[PDB]
């Protein structure tokens, strides 16, 4: 059971053609240089939507993380398989990519069968990678689950997240992964750890809770994170990002998820003839998982 350090980070790199003033190229470069980006074994990114900034980040990361997936949902190219409700015409990809210090033995993508609001119209889904680490295999699913979106009916977002977690569970079960091999789910799962949905997420994904969740209480801090506070000034702080092992599989003891509140040098953009300065590289905080 090789002990791995896993980062999950929502990068908030929206398409620059649609959103030219969100500092995407600046932040993508700065994310690859941030402290939380260094020293991991696996990195799972979400919202890497802008093709150029995502490509630049993946290139900037290639020295430390040479083995990488495409961004989920861009196309069928560069994957060993594509499953789920993939659309060839939809322009928006799922924004998820997995980067690894360790050789990738297999990589596939699966587009979610269930989604609502904005998520439905895009190729949101998950990446499945098998890594070769220390003489054995480690399985990682990287994803960005259904958001609590304006276009979803009341309760529909949570209902579709439940189906998304069970789709991942069913996918992993059908792989018949040996119990002595680790299986981790890493991503922005859009489930608040402080809410009742946390426990149903664990049951739906068949996930073991971390032995400890440490660091800052909120990986999506609408008060202390300067981007989240600008975009959602009246919404509660929540805690959405996880790396969790699968029940019944080998895993390190004392597995931790640490929410790391690392700020950035100020950067400024202009919008409607006003200047806005931020001190975070995204609206989320990175979560670093590993054996304590």
GROMACS .gro file of C-alpha atoms in nm:
model
  292
    1UNK     CA    1   0.000   0.000   0.000
    2UNK     CA    2   0.212   0.291  -0.125
    3UNK     CA    3   0.148   0.615   0.063
    4UNK     CA    4   0.068   0.897  -0.181
    5UNK     CA    5   0.016   1.273  -0.146
    6UNK     CA    6  -0.285   1.390  -0.349
    7UNK     CA    7  -0.388   1.748  -0.429
    8UNK     CA    8  -0.735   1.843  -0.546
    9UNK     CA    9  -0.780   2.202  -0.663
   10UNK     CA   10  -1.061   2.387  -0.840
   11UNK     CA   11  -0.872   2.633  -1.062
   12UNK     CA   12  -1.161   2.859  -1.176
   13UNK     CA   13  -1.013   2.887  -1.526
   14UNK     CA   14  -1.323   2.979  -1.722
   15UNK     CA   15  -1.295   3.019  -2.098
   16UNK     CA   16  -1.118   3.342  -2.184
   17UNK     CA   17  -1.321   3.394  -2.501
   18UNK     CA   18  -1.635   3.416  -2.286
   19UNK     CA   19  -1.469   3.580  -1.983
   20UNK     CA   20  -1.164   3.781  -2.092
   21UNK     CA   21  -1.114   3.963  -1.759
   22UNK     CA   22  -1.084   3.686  -1.497
   23UNK     CA   23  -0.702   3.677  -1.494
   24UNK     CA   24  -0.695   3.320  -1.624
   25UNK     CA   25  -0.351   3.323  -1.790
   26UNK     CA   26  -0.193   3.500  -1.493
   27UNK     CA   27  -0.351   3.266  -1.239
   28UNK     CA   28  -0.274   2.948  -1.436
   29UNK     CA   29   0.095   3.039  -1.435
   30UNK     CA   30   0.083   3.127  -1.064
   31UNK     CA   31  -0.100   2.804  -0.971
   32UNK     CA   32   0.184   2.593  -1.112
   33UNK     CA   33   0.427   2.791  -0.893
   34UNK     CA   34   0.222   2.791  -0.572
   35UNK     CA   35   0.349   2.606  -0.266
   36UNK     CA   36   0.047   2.376  -0.253
   37UNK     CA   37   0.122   2.266  -0.612
   38UNK     CA   38   0.469   2.132  -0.526
   39UNK     CA   39   0.561   1.800  -0.375
   40UNK     CA   40   0.253   1.595  -0.455
   41UNK     CA   41   0.226   1.254  -0.616
   42UNK     CA   42  -0.108   1.319  -0.792
   43UNK     CA   43  -0.284   1.646  -0.879
   44UNK     CA   44  -0.653   1.659  -0.975
   45UNK     CA   45  -0.775   1.990  -1.119
   46UNK     CA   46  -1.128   2.116  -1.181
   47UNK     CA   47  -1.262   2.404  -1.393
   48UNK     CA   48  -0.962   2.393  -1.629
   49UNK     CA   49  -1.203   2.511  -1.899
   50UNK     CA   50  -0.994   2.762  -2.094
   51UNK     CA   51  -0.806   2.547  -2.345
   52UNK     CA   52  -0.497   2.769  -2.364
   53UNK     CA   53  -0.454   2.840  -1.993
   54UNK     CA   54  -0.519   2.474  -1.910
   55UNK     CA   55  -0.266   2.367  -2.175
   56UNK     CA   56  -0.010   2.609  -2.030
   57UNK     CA   57  -0.063   2.481  -1.675
   58UNK     CA   58  -0.029   2.119  -1.790
   59UNK     CA   59   0.294   2.215  -1.970
   60UNK     CA   60   0.422   2.409  -1.668
   61UNK     CA   61   0.351   2.102  -1.452
   62UNK     CA   62   0.507   1.846  -1.687
   63UNK     CA   63   0.851   1.845  -1.522
   64UNK     CA   64   0.708   1.751  -1.180
   65UNK     CA   65   0.398   1.562  -1.307
   66UNK     CA   66   0.494   1.408  -1.643
   67UNK     CA   67   0.200   1.169  -1.682
   68UNK     CA   68  -0.126   1.347  -1.755
   69UNK     CA   69  -0.478   1.297  -1.884
   70UNK     CA   70  -0.652   1.528  -2.130
   71UNK     CA   71  -0.915   1.759  -1.991
   72UNK     CA   72  -1.228   1.546  -1.949
   73UNK     CA   73  -1.488   1.604  -2.218
   74UNK     CA   74  -1.280   1.791  -2.480
   75UNK     CA   75  -1.280   1.499  -2.725
   76UNK     CA   76  -1.228   1.123  -2.753
   77UNK     CA   77  -0.858   1.172  -2.838
   78UNK     CA   78  -0.588   1.080  -2.590
   79UNK     CA   79  -0.802   0.847  -2.376
   80UNK     CA   80  -0.795   0.468  -2.363
   81UNK     CA   81  -1.177   0.475  -2.350
   82UNK     CA   82  -1.468   0.720  -2.331
   83UNK     CA   83  -1.796   0.621  -2.165
   84UNK     CA   84  -2.111   0.783  -2.031
   85UNK     CA   85  -2.330   1.044  -2.202
   86UNK     CA   86  -2.048   1.204  -2.401
   87UNK     CA   87  -2.156   1.472  -2.650
   88UNK     CA   88  -1.945   1.547  -2.958
   89UNK     CA   89  -2.120   1.877  -3.032
   90UNK     CA   90  -2.126   2.049  -2.694
   91UNK     CA   91  -1.850   2.314  -2.677
   92UNK     CA   92  -1.791   2.309  -2.299
   93UNK     CA   93  -1.569   2.034  -2.160
   94UNK     CA   94  -1.580   1.901  -1.802
   95UNK     CA   95  -1.271   2.091  -1.684
   96UNK     CA   96  -1.111   1.793  -1.505
   97UNK     CA   97  -0.755   1.674  -1.562
   98UNK     CA   98  -0.529   1.441  -1.361
   99UNK     CA   99  -0.151   1.491  -1.338
  100UNK     CA  100   0.084   1.233  -1.193
  101UNK     CA  101   0.447   1.194  -1.092
  102UNK     CA  102   0.391   0.817  -1.147
  103UNK     CA  103   0.341   0.641  -1.482
  104UNK     CA  104  -0.016   0.610  -1.605
  105UNK     CA  105  -0.103   0.250  -1.696
  106UNK     CA  106  -0.456   0.333  -1.815
  107UNK     CA  107  -0.668   0.648  -1.848
  108UNK     CA  108  -1.037   0.676  -1.936
  109UNK     CA  109  -1.310   0.936  -1.912
  110UNK     CA  110  -1.679   0.892  -1.837
  111UNK     CA  111  -1.934   1.170  -1.888
  112UNK     CA  112  -2.205   1.180  -1.619
  113UNK     CA  113  -2.541   1.026  -1.707
  114UNK     CA  114  -2.722   1.257  -1.462
  115UNK     CA  115  -2.694   1.636  -1.430
  116UNK     CA  116  -2.912   1.948  -1.414
  117UNK     CA  117  -2.891   2.318  -1.490
  118UNK     CA  118  -2.571   2.429  -1.660
  119UNK     CA  119  -2.387   2.105  -1.581
  120UNK     CA  120  -2.618   1.899  -1.805
  121UNK     CA  121  -2.531   2.094  -2.120
  122UNK     CA  122  -2.156   2.037  -2.082
  123UNK     CA  123  -1.937   1.725  -2.082
  124UNK     CA  124  -1.901   1.711  -1.703
  125UNK     CA  125  -1.773   1.375  -1.588
  126UNK     CA  126  -1.481   1.191  -1.433
  127UNK     CA  127  -1.137   1.066  -1.529
  128UNK     CA  128  -1.021   0.719  -1.424
  129UNK     CA  129  -0.646   0.658  -1.403
  130UNK     CA  130  -0.446   0.352  -1.302
  131UNK     CA  131  -0.100   0.449  -1.179
  132UNK     CA  132   0.206   0.227  -1.138
  133UNK     CA  133   0.362   0.316  -0.800
  134UNK     CA  134   0.608   0.115  -0.590
  135UNK     CA  135   0.557  -0.218  -0.764
  136UNK     CA  136   0.177  -0.204  -0.760
  137UNK     CA  137  -0.124  -0.013  -0.892
  138UNK     CA  138  -0.316   0.283  -0.750
  139UNK     CA  139  -0.654   0.386  -0.892
  140UNK     CA  140  -0.771   0.748  -0.896
  141UNK     CA  141  -1.104   0.895  -1.005
  142UNK     CA  142  -1.086   1.272  -1.053
  143UNK     CA  143  -1.408   1.465  -1.091
  144UNK     CA  144  -1.614   1.779  -1.043
  145UNK     CA  145  -1.965   1.683  -0.931
  146UNK     CA  146  -2.297   1.859  -0.997
  147UNK     CA  147  -2.306   2.221  -0.882
  148UNK     CA  148  -2.598   2.376  -0.693
  149UNK     CA  149  -2.707   2.560  -1.005
  150UNK     CA  150  -2.977   2.816  -1.084
  151UNK     CA  151  -3.116   2.591  -1.359
  152UNK     CA  152  -3.173   2.298  -1.124
  153UNK     CA  153  -3.510   2.257  -0.957
  154UNK     CA  154  -3.519   2.254  -0.577
  155UNK     CA  155  -3.339   1.941  -0.458
  156UNK     CA  156  -3.246   1.840  -0.814
  157UNK     CA  157  -2.875   1.925  -0.780
  158UNK     CA  158  -2.835   1.704  -0.472
  159UNK     CA  159  -3.037   1.427  -0.638
  160UNK     CA  160  -2.809   1.432  -0.942
  161UNK     CA  161  -2.493   1.443  -0.729
  162UNK     CA  162  -2.621   1.127  -0.562
  163UNK     CA  163  -2.662   0.959  -0.901
  164UNK     CA  164  -2.317   1.084  -1.009
  165UNK     CA  165  -2.151   0.929  -0.703
  166UNK     CA  166  -2.339   0.602  -0.763
  167UNK     CA  167  -2.237   0.606  -1.130
  168UNK     CA  168  -1.873   0.630  -1.017
  169UNK     CA  169  -1.933   0.349  -0.767
  170UNK     CA  170  -2.089   0.130  -1.036
  171UNK     CA  171  -1.803   0.204  -1.276
  172UNK     CA  172  -1.542   0.109  -1.015
  173UNK     CA  173  -1.727  -0.208  -0.913
  174UNK     CA  174  -1.746  -0.329  -1.275
  175UNK     CA  175  -1.367  -0.290  -1.300
  176UNK     CA  176  -1.336  -0.562  -1.031
  177UNK     CA  177  -1.037  -0.385  -0.876
  178UNK     CA  178  -0.837  -0.611  -0.639
  179UNK     CA  179  -0.902  -0.522  -0.276
  180UNK     CA  180  -0.527  -0.495  -0.211
  181UNK     CA  181  -0.506  -0.200  -0.456
  182UNK     CA  182  -0.593   0.154  -0.346
  183UNK     CA  183  -0.888   0.338  -0.503
  184UNK     CA  184  -0.923   0.711  -0.434
  185UNK     CA  185  -1.191   0.960  -0.541
  186UNK     CA  186  -1.055   1.314  -0.565
  187UNK     CA  187  -1.241   1.625  -0.666
  188UNK     CA  188  -1.469   1.917  -0.606
  189UNK     CA  189  -1.761   1.701  -0.497
  190UNK     CA  190  -1.990   2.001  -0.427
  191UNK     CA  191  -2.103   1.846  -0.096
  192UNK     CA  192  -2.060   2.054   0.221
  193UNK     CA  193  -1.875   1.853   0.487
  194UNK     CA  194  -2.075   2.043   0.750
  195UNK     CA  195  -2.410   1.922   0.607
  196UNK     CA  196  -2.618   1.604   0.617
  197UNK     CA  197  -2.534   1.541   0.250
  198UNK     CA  198  -2.175   1.458   0.357
  199UNK     CA  199  -2.292   1.125   0.501
  200UNK     CA  200  -2.501   1.040   0.194
  201UNK     CA  201  -2.203   1.120  -0.031
  202UNK     CA  202  -1.995   0.863   0.162
  203UNK     CA  203  -2.270   0.602   0.122
  204UNK     CA  204  -2.335   0.681  -0.246
  205UNK     CA  205  -1.966   0.664  -0.342
  206UNK     CA  206  -1.896   0.376  -0.101
  207UNK     CA  207  -1.623   0.597   0.046
  208UNK     CA  208  -1.434   0.574   0.375
  209UNK     CA  209  -1.419   0.908   0.560
  210UNK     CA  210  -1.074   1.049   0.612
  211UNK     CA  211  -0.939   0.977   0.958
  212UNK     CA  212  -0.908   1.354   0.995
  213UNK     CA  213  -1.007   1.664   0.802
  214UNK     CA  214  -0.762   1.934   0.905
  215UNK     CA  215  -0.665   2.291   0.829
  216UNK     CA  216  -0.908   2.565   0.736
  217UNK     CA  217  -1.275   2.474   0.799
  218UNK     CA  218  -1.404   2.582   0.454
  219UNK     CA  219  -1.250   2.495   0.119
  220UNK     CA  220  -1.509   2.732  -0.041
  221UNK     CA  221  -1.490   3.031   0.196
  222UNK     CA  222  -1.727   3.302   0.071
  223UNK     CA  223  -1.595   3.530   0.349
  224UNK     CA  224  -1.213   3.491   0.360
  225UNK     CA  225  -1.145   3.391  -0.003
  226UNK     CA  226  -1.134   3.708  -0.213
  227UNK     CA  227  -1.268   3.547  -0.534
  228UNK     CA  228  -1.545   3.352  -0.361
  229UNK     CA  229  -1.644   3.661  -0.161
  230UNK     CA  230  -1.675   3.866  -0.480
  231UNK     CA  231  -1.883   3.607  -0.666
  232UNK     CA  232  -2.107   3.492  -0.377
  233UNK     CA  233  -2.113   3.769  -0.115
  234UNK     CA  234  -2.442   3.656   0.046
  235UNK     CA  235  -2.387   3.281   0.038
  236UNK     CA  236  -2.271   3.066   0.330
  237UNK     CA  237  -1.920   2.931   0.361
  238UNK     CA  238  -1.898   2.561   0.273
  239UNK     CA  239  -1.642   2.285   0.247
  240UNK     CA  240  -1.657   2.096  -0.080
  241UNK     CA  241  -1.326   1.932  -0.181
  242UNK     CA  242  -1.212   1.579  -0.090
  243UNK     CA  243  -0.973   1.291  -0.152
  244UNK     CA  244  -1.134   0.976  -0.010
  245UNK     CA  245  -1.047   0.607  -0.028
  246UNK     CA  246  -1.295   0.336  -0.129
  247UNK     CA  247  -1.441   0.100   0.130
  248UNK     CA  248  -1.292  -0.249   0.122
  249UNK     CA  249  -0.963  -0.145  -0.041
  250UNK     CA  250  -0.618  -0.104   0.108
  251UNK     CA  251  -0.539   0.248   0.224
  252UNK     CA  252  -0.284   0.417   0.452
  253UNK     CA  253  -0.372   0.456   0.816
  254UNK     CA  254  -0.432   0.806   0.943
  255UNK     CA  255  -0.549   0.938   0.607
  256UNK     CA  256  -0.596   1.316   0.618
  257UNK     CA  257  -0.752   1.587   0.401
  258UNK     CA  258  -0.598   1.928   0.482
  259UNK     CA  259  -0.764   2.247   0.356
  260UNK     CA  260  -0.473   2.483   0.287
  261UNK     CA  261  -0.554   2.856   0.300
  262UNK     CA  262  -0.262   2.982   0.088
  263UNK     CA  263  -0.303   3.334  -0.051
  264UNK     CA  264  -0.139   3.491  -0.354
  265UNK     CA  265   0.026   3.818  -0.439
  266UNK     CA  266  -0.239   4.070  -0.548
  267UNK     CA  267  -0.348   4.071  -0.910
  268UNK     CA  268  -0.584   4.318  -1.069
  269UNK     CA  269  -0.829   4.308  -1.358
  270UNK     CA  270  -1.071   4.560  -1.507
  271UNK     CA  271  -1.446   4.509  -1.551
  272UNK     CA  272  -1.698   4.770  -1.668
  273UNK     CA  273  -1.449   5.049  -1.614
  274UNK     CA  274  -1.370   4.942  -1.259
  275UNK     CA  275  -1.058   4.781  -1.117
  276UNK     CA  276  -1.075   4.472  -0.896
  277UNK     CA  277  -0.783   4.330  -0.696
  278UNK     CA  278  -0.777   3.973  -0.565
  279UNK     CA  279  -0.539   3.784  -0.336
  280UNK     CA  280  -0.636   3.424  -0.420
  281UNK     CA  281  -0.569   3.211  -0.726
  282UNK     CA  282  -0.923   3.068  -0.729
  283UNK     CA  283  -1.242   3.070  -0.527
  284UNK     CA  284  -1.152   2.739  -0.361
  285UNK     CA  285  -0.870   2.648  -0.134
  286UNK     CA  286  -0.651   2.352  -0.232
  287UNK     CA  287  -0.703   2.030  -0.038
  288UNK     CA  288  -0.394   1.815   0.018
  289UNK     CA  289  -0.454   1.455   0.118
  290UNK     CA  290  -0.203   1.213   0.263
  291UNK     CA  291  -0.111   0.983   0.547
  292UNK     CA  292  -0.058   1.180   0.865
   0.00000   0.00000   0.00000
